Design a protein around this motif. Sequence first.
Motif, short mmCIF file in Angstrom:
data_model
loop_
_atom_site.label_atom_id
_atom_site.label_comp_id
_atom_site.label_asym_id
_atom_site.label_seq_id
_atom_site.Cartn_x
_atom_site.Cartn_y
_atom_site.Cartn_z
N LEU A 228 61.79 99.00 79.30
CA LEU A 228 62.41 97.70 79.33
C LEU A 228 63.27 97.71 80.61
O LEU A 228 63.29 96.34 80.83
CB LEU A 228 63.48 97.76 78.03
CG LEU A 228 62.48 98.04 76.65
CD1 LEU A 228 63.53 98.01 75.39
CD2 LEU A 228 61.62 96.90 76.40
N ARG A 229 63.69 98.58 81.20
CA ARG A 229 64.44 98.60 82.39
C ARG A 229 63.46 97.88 83.52
O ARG A 229 63.77 97.03 84.11
CB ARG A 229 64.97 99.58 82.95
CG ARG A 229 66.35 100.02 82.10
CD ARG A 229 66.98 101.31 82.33
NE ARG A 229 67.67 101.80 81.10
CZ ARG A 229 68.57 102.78 81.16
NH1 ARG A 229 68.62 103.51 82.22
NH2 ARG A 229 69.13 103.00 79.92
N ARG A 230 62.25 98.37 83.52
CA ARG A 230 60.99 98.08 84.28
C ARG A 230 60.63 96.70 83.97
O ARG A 230 60.45 95.92 84.84
CB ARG A 230 59.97 98.83 84.38
CG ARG A 230 60.14 100.28 85.14
CD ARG A 230 59.98 99.91 86.76
NE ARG A 230 60.35 101.01 87.58
CZ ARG A 230 59.36 102.01 87.88
NH1 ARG A 230 58.29 102.32 87.42
NH2 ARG A 230 59.93 102.95 89.02
N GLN B 255 64.08 102.22 76.35
CA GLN B 255 64.81 101.59 77.36
C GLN B 255 64.38 101.39 79.03
O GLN B 255 64.40 100.31 79.42
CB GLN B 255 66.31 102.20 77.72
CG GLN B 255 66.76 103.20 76.62
CD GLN B 255 66.34 104.79 76.97
OE1 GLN B 255 65.93 105.01 78.17
NE2 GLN B 255 65.99 105.55 75.95
N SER C 294 62.46 94.02 82.66
CA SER C 294 63.44 93.06 82.95
C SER C 294 63.85 93.15 84.14
O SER C 294 64.20 91.77 84.81
CB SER C 294 64.72 93.81 81.92
OG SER C 294 65.25 94.89 82.41
N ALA C 295 63.83 94.10 85.07
CA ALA C 295 63.66 94.24 86.44
C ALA C 295 62.57 93.44 87.01
O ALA C 295 62.89 92.90 88.25
CB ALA C 295 63.98 95.60 86.99
N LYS D 277 57.30 93.46 74.97
CA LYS D 277 58.23 94.30 74.52
C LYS D 277 57.77 94.99 73.20
O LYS D 277 57.92 96.22 72.88
CB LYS D 277 59.17 93.65 74.70
CG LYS D 277 59.85 93.50 76.22
CD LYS D 277 61.16 93.03 76.55
CE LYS D 277 61.65 93.19 78.08
NZ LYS D 277 63.04 92.51 78.22
N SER E 105 65.21 104.86 88.16
CA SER E 105 65.20 105.40 89.36
C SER E 105 66.37 106.88 89.63
O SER E 105 66.34 107.20 90.51
CB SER E 105 65.79 104.38 90.64
OG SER E 105 66.88 103.69 90.41
N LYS F 263 58.52 88.98 75.29
CA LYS F 263 59.16 89.42 74.25
C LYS F 263 58.10 90.22 73.35
O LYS F 263 58.24 91.20 72.48
CB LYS F 263 59.56 88.44 73.43
CG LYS F 263 60.88 89.10 72.13
CD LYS F 263 61.28 88.15 71.08
CE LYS F 263 62.09 87.23 72.16
NZ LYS F 263 62.94 86.28 70.90
N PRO G 222 61.56 84.74 91.49
CA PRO G 222 62.46 83.88 92.43
C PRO G 222 61.52 82.72 93.02
O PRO G 222 62.04 81.97 93.64
CB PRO G 222 62.53 84.83 93.27
CG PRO G 222 61.67 85.84 93.31
CD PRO G 222 60.94 85.75 92.04
N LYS H 99 51.86 86.91 92.28
CA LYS H 99 52.64 86.26 91.13
C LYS H 99 52.18 85.45 90.35
O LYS H 99 51.70 84.16 90.99
CB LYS H 99 54.18 85.94 91.89
CG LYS H 99 54.68 87.34 92.67
CD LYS H 99 56.26 86.78 93.33
CE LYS H 99 56.74 88.19 94.10
NZ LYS H 99 58.16 87.66 94.77
N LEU I 103 61.03 91.11 85.84
CA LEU I 103 61.05 89.73 85.83
C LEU I 103 61.78 88.91 86.88
O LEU I 103 61.32 88.14 87.26
CB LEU I 103 62.11 89.13 84.57
CG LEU I 103 61.44 89.10 83.17
CD1 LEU I 103 62.52 89.19 82.13
CD2 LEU I 103 60.51 87.90 83.19
N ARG I 104 62.81 89.72 87.40
CA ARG I 104 63.66 89.31 88.53
C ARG I 104 62.86 89.20 89.94
O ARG I 104 63.16 88.61 90.43
CB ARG I 104 64.87 90.07 88.97
CG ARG I 104 65.90 90.34 88.02
CD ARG I 104 67.08 91.24 88.62
NE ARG I 104 68.24 91.48 87.68
CZ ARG I 104 69.29 92.02 88.27
NH1 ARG I 104 69.44 92.63 89.54
NH2 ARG I 104 70.48 92.51 87.36
N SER I 105 61.90 90.15 89.84
CA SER I 105 60.72 90.17 90.99
C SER I 105 59.84 89.06 91.06
O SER I 105 59.36 88.47 91.90
CB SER I 105 60.07 91.66 91.12
OG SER I 105 59.10 92.00 90.12
N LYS J 148 65.53 81.29 91.52
CA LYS J 148 66.47 81.53 92.60
C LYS J 148 67.34 80.35 92.98
O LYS J 148 68.19 80.49 93.90
CB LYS J 148 65.86 82.37 93.77
CG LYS J 148 66.87 83.28 94.60
CD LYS J 148 67.51 84.33 93.47
CE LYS J 148 68.85 85.08 93.95
NZ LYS J 148 69.21 86.28 93.14
#
Lengths: 125, 228, 150, 132, 134
Positions: free
Chosen positions: E114-116, E111, E118-119, E97, E37, E94, E126, E60, E121-123, E130
């Motif tokens: 990969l930021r997208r 990177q 890994s990020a 990736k 971003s 992986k 949950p 999801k 994943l959090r989206s 969570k």
Amino acid sequence: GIDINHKYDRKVRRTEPKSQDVYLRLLVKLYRFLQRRTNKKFNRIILKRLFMSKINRPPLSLQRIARFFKAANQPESTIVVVGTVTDDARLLVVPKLTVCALHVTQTARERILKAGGEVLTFDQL
Amino acid sequence: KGKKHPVNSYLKGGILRYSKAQMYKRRALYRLKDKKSPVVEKAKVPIKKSKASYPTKTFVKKRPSKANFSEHKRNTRRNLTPGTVLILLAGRHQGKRVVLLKVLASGLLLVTGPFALNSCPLRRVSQRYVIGTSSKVDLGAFKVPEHLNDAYFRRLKAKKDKKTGEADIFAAKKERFVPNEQRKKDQKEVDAALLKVIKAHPEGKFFAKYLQNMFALHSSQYPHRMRF
Amino acid sequence: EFPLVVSDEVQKVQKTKQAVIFLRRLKIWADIQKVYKSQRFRAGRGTMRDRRRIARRGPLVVYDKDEGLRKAFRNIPGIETINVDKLNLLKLAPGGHVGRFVIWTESAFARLNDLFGTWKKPSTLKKGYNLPQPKMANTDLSRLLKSEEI
Amino acid sequence: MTIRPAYRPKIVKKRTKHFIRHQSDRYAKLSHKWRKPKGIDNRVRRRFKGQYLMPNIGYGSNKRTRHMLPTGFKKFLVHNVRELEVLLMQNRVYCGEIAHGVSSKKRKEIVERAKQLSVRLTNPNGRLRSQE
Amino acid sequence: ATSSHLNWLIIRNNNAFLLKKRDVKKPFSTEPNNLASVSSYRYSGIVHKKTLGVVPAADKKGFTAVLKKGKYAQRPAKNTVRVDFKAGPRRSLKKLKNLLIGSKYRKDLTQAALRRASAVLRSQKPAPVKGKKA
RNA sequence: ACCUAUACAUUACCGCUAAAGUAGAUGAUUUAUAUUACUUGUGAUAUAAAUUUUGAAACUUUAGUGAGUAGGAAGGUACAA
RNA sequence: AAGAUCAAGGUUAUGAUAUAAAUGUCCCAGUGGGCCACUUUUGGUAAGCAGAACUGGCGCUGUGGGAUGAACCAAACGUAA
RNA sequence: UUAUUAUAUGCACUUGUAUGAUUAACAAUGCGAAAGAUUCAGGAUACCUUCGGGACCCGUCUUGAAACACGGACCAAGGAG
């Protein structure tokens, strides 16, 4: 009790051209990469010569391009002008060269291209 | 089986080593092995070993680059020679004198009262806590803390609770207090040998019946011209 | 595509409904929807001045010939129509921000030629207007750096 | 709880006290909002001892501690959901700070989205409310 | 008429998608293939033809929708999805990736993608995490 | 001998000035190894791992200095449109 | 006598330095009411008086010091240990 | 002739010395204990308290303003390169 850190420590000279022009700064960025990377003073002053205000940049006329040809050791020469290049009507015979310039006035481009010369951008030079 | 120097530690820049190495010096016999080998295996039968790309893949958590390991330079003691009878000027055994038994690898002191007299355990205390008094107990009789090492008194155990593994536990284990039988036996043997040497010196402030008393630099007495 | 050229049959469109049917398929849909939703009551004082607020200037459709294009187009919110002759700077770069979504009719795009002829040839309306010769020919600095020759 | 932004050196606030403007304690007309004493009689301007402190640059915080909230998170003024989505990659430098003009119904969405993204919100208890 | 030099210089301050919230030097890019971003030079639409986009999923968590770059060929003229190309993947990170490293003949990003990853994943996670719960 | 200014020394840190680089990513660089070439030892290549998408109208990096009315310039902040 | 062409010359022909310097534009503000001290002095018995010469402050300067203090002494002040 | 010093001392390993702002080996303690929420550390927020030291009224003309110089009781809003 600093004897004496008076002045001048503000100095004199532009790091970067005082111009919004997105084109102009790209040439500066190009020659700035060419400066230290390739040694030689042609890169060093053309970088500076883009910094130059409109005054100190006053238009070089086509007859001045044609008198330089009369110079010895100069026939194979691509004349650099960091400047506006202006058409001189009075020169009857305009000699062949490729001329590299920031800007060439449209009447000056026709008498270079008629000669038959090339009007060139500095990035291609 | 050797060749050494560097007396640089006195000098402090210098030699012996360069000069003697030259006297000895070869000019012949420079041949070498020293086998490397990895074990990065795609050993594939089907057995197929790898590892792939785990991750160092940017879950960008900025975590502080580990500041690696300062040197183990052997803690040069002050002339606190074991057994100097010295004062614990600080922490529960405040103004009780105790006898030194040893230097350990952690840098700090082994102290026993003797226990039976001035109520101070097999207890370890800082080199700095201590004024090292001129009075010396013959430290030759001892079993020595060759047997008492860092690990020995390291606690068996502050579990967070009832041995095992995650039994949702309860308030109060024994962080300081049972006590252990192994530790008692260790004291009583060492203290017994302490008592034999310590009885040779006459009563008062701090060797045998001398030991009991609790220190007095009495009002109008002087911590500065006490050449302890 | 860019630059988006669509058949001259687009000019003939008598009706607003017919217009929207074309535009959406032609792929306006999201951008026309960008308009209508956004209409919002002016925050100023500007509300009293008849400056009711700003809603999204979606697409500039350009025509050579008005065969009923304009009236159909006028209605639909934030969608403005221009003639190749007039080509307003205000419409092409609103707020001096370059990058209007422009759709041209097939006749209109063809007519953009003699209008502003090229570098060689004259802007027929615009007398002694030379559309500027570029100061950097390639302008892609990275290939010039890349370069072999450098 | 929420995992702190990127290993800061301890935030030296270096002069903490609001500069207050000379004689704001004398006068309610003279606002605590600082206005520099230009005037020829000023003992403040000639920086006599005991006439407070004039904002001089050297109270200036380290350019590393610049912006960081002491739970690390720098303030991003979050108008809504899409605005929140900017700081998905930038958990570890920025916090969503729900603008006061935002209604509760949207706030419930913002807080909910914020938990998914795992980016800190400084104020949730914002507009909450035993209310409709 | 297009350079990966001009297009940032044009847009530096005047980008709708670059929204500056509070002081804060530079920056924030919303510009639909940012990957970080940021907003730098290369964390953006042109650039030219190197732009990964990642969108989950919708419902999801089948898909971290990867959009495969597309140089030089198409100009990258609207669009037939050409600067992007919609490889809907699945399963275990992986692999996706390492699989990304192979399609990264264009390694500029590495990177960023990969930021997208890994990020996202959090989206995506949950709904089945969570917690806590043991 | 002692005491002690915003002086003086050193250090962190602010700013301003100075001084230098930064801008082959279809690429570059590091690390480990297998193979191959040469040679003792090095490079090439293959493979695996890792770093690198720089407001390059800024950052990284650096040093020296800062009283200040009148005044000048520079850069922001707030307010209505 | 100048302009001056040509050839000869070991070491550049006191010492520290240069915070780089020179140069131009603005015709720019601000100023045109000074005050004080060492030293030198004129008028006046003299004055915290009227007026010069040189130089520094104060004017625009706190801090430490002279108990105190516009000016004397020490010292010129980013923020702290 | 003697002493001293340097070179002819390679390769492996190394928690060894430095690498130009080289604070960490080692260890103890609090504790993140789901929500809930203990405990520890740290703070001239507002403001109170306790101690020391410092702080004379701004604006202004003026050489100099805390002045026994002048305007300004207090507050809001209009309000001038």
